[PDB]
Design a protein around this ligand. Structure first.
Ligand SMILES: OC[C@H]1O[C@H](O[C@H]2[C@H](O)[C@@H](O)[C@@H](O[C@H]3[C@H](O)[C@@H](O)[C@@H](O)O[C@@H]3CO)O[C@@H]2CO)[C@H](O)[C@@H](O)[C@@H]1O
Length: 483
């Protein structure tokens, strides 16, 4: 009763209200309603929901996540005409290329900068090493020098990488997925410096994104480390801030990762054409990007015409100076393993639960680890459902032999093979996508009952290999059934 609908997911720190404004212009022109959501952990949830119908038509994230999604067949291939391709910077298209395919529309280039309060700190430090002394000075005055998010490795990486840390080695035109730079002398020096800041009480291991933002925006701390999306909240506050180059460490620049905010289209969306129309004709226009940017700044936008108009913004200039000193994020599937490993290391080293050496050595091994067997690309995860509701569990498997596909069997408990229970309340659905060479296997549980709850198993086999995983279903009583 709208003409149609598009569902968009974007992270909660981005300009979702501006994006909804572009959506309202789309609706008015087109009759198609646009809903912009920003669920928690959307980037982890997307693979599970992509092909169920609870998936978004469009997903926004930095480009690093998208190679993994593409390996799993989750993203529609983008094949633009030259006319449109030429409107965006080739650099931004490069970020969304995976094994010869464009897998998203690039939106904007982001990097972290040093953001400082000019009334507490007219001249911000040039080196990380000066920060302890600055903080002693500010503490005597009831403030602190620096607060930033210590829970996400994105924010600590620039210091870790400064003297020699790296994610994956790049050479002869490709990333070496096995060659990781997490436990070298450089990374250890950077993480040790961070840990010592915390030991010396210049920072607190528990500081997260909200805490640091509140502290900076209320004038409690002289500096923070953040990206373009944060500037508009600071504008609302009383703070006179600058945006500048990150401090050096051991004489070397901090090396922030460069992220390209990108918009991928769900391969399972029935609305791919509408999604492209929205993205090309509404969002990636001067007027569209202005709406989003005015909500939460995007950085250096991919659209040449508008990037040129904003380039005079000194905040954007500083963003790009930091970006030039840093490294572009890889988009390889292994980046997930890298990020999870480094997150663990920083949190454990910062809190004192592990030594820096132990944290980084473990993270080095974990970031490079492979799936031993190499069948599952995506495993079904624990689920919850209300009594009478429906739930879909999914597995994705990498195809290999053309002649002998992988075969999946689903079980409840030790031995009940669910193909023997297909009926009114259970379905099994298989498909293959030759574009991605990915097999999708689904188990559908409908009219869920208390008895449906418990442990299940998904077994995948080929002529010579086998793997299996377990997952749990929790069945909740409906609200209003009691009392
Ligand atoms: O820490 C665990 C975490 O690792 C992974 O997230 C990384 C992102 O994929 C990556 O893009 C980057 O995220 C930052 C955005 O680019 C930026 O625009 C912004 O919103 O801040 C984000 C950092 O909070 O960095 C992280 C790691 O910090 C992964 O894909 C997640 O599932 C995950 O929970």
């Amino acid at each position: 009763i709208e003409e149609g609908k598009l569902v968009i997911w974007i992270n909660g720190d981005k300009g979702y209200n501006g994006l909804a404004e572009v959506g309202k212009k789309f609706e008015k022109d087109t009759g198609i309603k646009v809903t912009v959501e920003h669920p928690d952990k959307l980037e982890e949830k997307f693979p599970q929901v992509a092909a169920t119908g609870d998936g978004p038509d469009i997903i926004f994230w930095a480009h690093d996540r998208f190679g993994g999604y593409a390996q799993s067949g989750l993203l529609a291939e983008i094949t633009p005409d030259k006319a449109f391709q030429d409107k965006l910077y080739p650099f931004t298209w490069d970020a969304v290329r995976y094994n010869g395919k464009l897998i998203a529309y690039p939106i904007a280039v982001e990097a972290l900068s040093l953001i400082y309060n000019k009334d507490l700190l007219p001249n911000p430090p040039k080196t990380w090493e000066e920060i302890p002394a600055l903080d002693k000075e500010l503490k005597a005055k009831g403030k602190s020098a620096l607060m930033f998010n210590l829970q996400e490795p994105y924010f600590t990486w620039p210091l870790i990488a400064a003297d020699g840390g790296y994610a994956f080695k790049y050479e002869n035109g490709k990333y070496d997925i096995k060659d990781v730079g997490v436990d070298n002398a450089g990374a250890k020096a950077g993480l040790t410096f961070l840990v010592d800041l915390i030991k010396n009480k210049h920072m607190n291991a528990d500081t997260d994104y909200s805490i640091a933002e509140a502290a900076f925006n209320k004038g409690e701390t002289a500096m923070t480390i953040n990206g373009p999306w944060a500037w508009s909240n600071i504008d609302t506050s009383k703070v006179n801030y600058g945006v500048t180059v990150l401090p050096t460490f051991k004489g070397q620049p901090s090396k922030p990762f460069v992220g390209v905010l990108s918009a991928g289209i769900n391969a399972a969306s029935p609305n791919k054409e509408l999604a492209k129309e929205f993205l090309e004709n509404y969002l990636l226009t001067d007027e569209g990007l202005e709406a989003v940017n005015k909500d939460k700044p995007l950085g250096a936008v991919a659209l040449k015409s508008y990037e040129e108009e904003l380039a005079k913004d000194p905040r954007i200039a500083a963003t790009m100076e930091n970006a030039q000193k840093g490294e572009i994020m890889p988009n390889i599937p292994q980046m997930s393993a890298f990020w999870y490993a480094v997150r663990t290391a920083v949190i454990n080293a910062a809190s004192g639960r592990q030594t820096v050496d132990a944290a980084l050595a473990a993270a080095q091994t974990n970031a490079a680890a492979d799936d031993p067997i190499g069948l599952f690309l995506m495993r079904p995860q624990d689920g919850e459902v209300t009594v009478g509701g429906s739930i879909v569990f999914s597995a994705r498997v990498a195809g290999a032999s053309l002649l002998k596909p992988p075969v999946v069997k689903w079980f409840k408990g030790k031995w009940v093979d669910l193909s023997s229970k297909v009926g009114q309340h259970l379905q099994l659905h298989d498909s293959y996508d030759r574009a991605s060479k990915v097999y999708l296997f689904e188990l559908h549980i409908t009219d869920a009952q208390t008895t449906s709850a418990g442990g299940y198993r998904c077994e995948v086999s080929t002529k010579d290999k086998f793997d299996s995983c377990n997952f749990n279903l929790t069945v909740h009583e409906a609200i209003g059934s009691g009392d």
